[PDB]
Paper text:
The collagenases consist of a [name] module (s1), a variable number of polycystic kidney disease-like (PKD-like) domains (s2a and s2b in [name] and s2 in [name]) and a variable number of collagen-binding domains (s3 in [name] and s3a and s3b in [name]). The X-ray crystal structures of Ca2+-bound holo s2a (space group C2), Ca2+-free apo s2a (space group P61), Ca2+-bound holo s2b (space group P21) and two new forms of N-terminally truncated wild-type apo s2 (space groups P21 and P212121) are reported for the first time. Comparison of crystal structures of [name] s2 with crystal structures of [name] s2a and s2b suggests that despite common tertiary folds, PKD-like domains can be grouped into two subsets.
Here, the molecules spiral along the crystallographic axis. Along this axis, molecule pairs A and G, B and E, C and F, and D and H are related by NCS translation that results in an off-origin peak that is 63.9% of the origin peak in the Patterson map. One calcium-binding site with a pentagonal bipyramidal geometry was identified near the N-terminus in each domain. The pentagonal base is composed of OD1 of Asn685, the main-chain carbonyl of Ser686, OD1 and OD2 of Asp713 and a water molecule, while the axial positions are filled by OD1 of Asp715 and OD2 of Asp754. In the s2a structures the termini are the most flexible. As mentioned, the B-factor trends in all holo and apo s2a structures are similar despite the difference in crystal packing.
Residue numbers in the entry: 685 to 770
The structure:
């Protein structure tokens, strides 16, 4: 099995309470399909949406992780940052 490629499309920028549109566009699996997307927004929150919208209550730089899992149950993880300013 080839592991899937997740594409997390960072880096991200926004202000406090701004709904940041996260995108996994360009993720693929060479020899099957991606069946799940798991996001960790770095503030303790997660999502299983393919392209979640998420806002951050407070200024900061958050580590964002995207785990993609293919039809064989194997996964790969990629990371970026979201920089949230005043
Ligand atoms: Ca695969």
């Amino acid at each position: 099995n080839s592991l899937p490629y997740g594409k997390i499309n960072g880096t991200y920028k926004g202000t406090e309470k701004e709904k940041i549109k996260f995108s996994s566009e360009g993720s693929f699996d060479p020899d099957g399909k991606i069946v799940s997307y798991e996001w960790d927004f770095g503030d303790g929150n997660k999502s299983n949406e393919e392209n979640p919208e998420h806002s951050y209550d407070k200024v900061g730089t958050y580590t964002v992780k995207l785990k993609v899992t293919d039809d064989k149950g194997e996964s790969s993880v990629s990371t970026t940052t979201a920089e949230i300013k005043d």
